[PDB]
Design a protein around this ligand. Structure first.
Ligand SMILES: O=C(Nc1ccc2c(c1)CNC2)c1cc(F)c2[nH]ccc2c1
Lengths: 156, 39
């Protein structure tokens, strides 16, 4: 079906009406999203079928039609934009300065913006428009609010 | 059966709404890909 580069909504008709379960990036013929959005299931793009190619539950990522193509990384200093695609609402850029998730295996960038869980898979951008990660996997703080990591895959 | 719909181009927008804080949090990542707060 449609394989043009850009941000896409991931929808389902299993629930009442049409429901948005997540978002994804189409780049170089490859659809990239978070594992918890699709659970590795096949996707439909009009009459076409998108079969999974690579996935990992721990990284919480999955690619369709080919290997992971997104390799840009947060520089640790600059502000970034979350191209949030919320359910029933238009795609909208939100600029923020990321925080840090400190782990036993190193530090990761983290964005602190409040969006429904259906916004998961929405890309995080650098000043050049390059996808430095996806939004949708993080932690719940004392405030009940959500802080998501800047999740990036590996390009081979 | 899940399906996809195009929602826009991937571009940085100058003068976008700037919001959100920059917290430094101690976290752990488990085998299920789930983050948790460490204190
Ligand atoms: O639950 C969320 N994300 C998730 C779900 C299931 C799994 C993982 C992450 C990784 N392992 C399996 C989520 C994502 C968001 F964007 C949110 N915004 C507010 C709340 C919230 C919650």
């Amino acid at each position: 079906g449609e394989t043009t580069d850009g941000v896409y909504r991931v929808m389902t008709r299993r629930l009442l009406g049409s429901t948005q379960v997540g978002v994804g990036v189409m780049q170089e013929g490859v659809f990239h999203t978070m594992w918890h959005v699709t659970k590795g299931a096949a996707l439909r793009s009009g009459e076409g079928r998108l079969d999974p190619y690579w996935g990992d539950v721990k990284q919480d990522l999955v690619s369709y039609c080919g290997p992971w193509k997104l390799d840009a990384a947060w520089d640790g200093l600059s502000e970034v934009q979350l191209l949030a695609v919320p359910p029933g609402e238009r795609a909208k850029n939100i600029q923020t300065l990321p925080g840090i998730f400190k782990t036993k295996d190193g530090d990761i960038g983290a964005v602190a913006l409040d969006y429904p869980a259906g916004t998961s898979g929405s890309p995080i951008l650098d000043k050049c428009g390059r996808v430095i990660g996806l939004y949708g996997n993080g932690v719940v703080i004392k405030n009940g609010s959500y802080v998501s990591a800047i999740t990036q895959g590996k390009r081979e | 059966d899940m399906y996809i719909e195009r929602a826009g181009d991937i571009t940085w927008e100058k003068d976008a709404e700037v919001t959100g804080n920059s917290p430094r949090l101690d976290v752990a990542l488990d085998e299920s890909g789930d983050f948790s707060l460490v204190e």
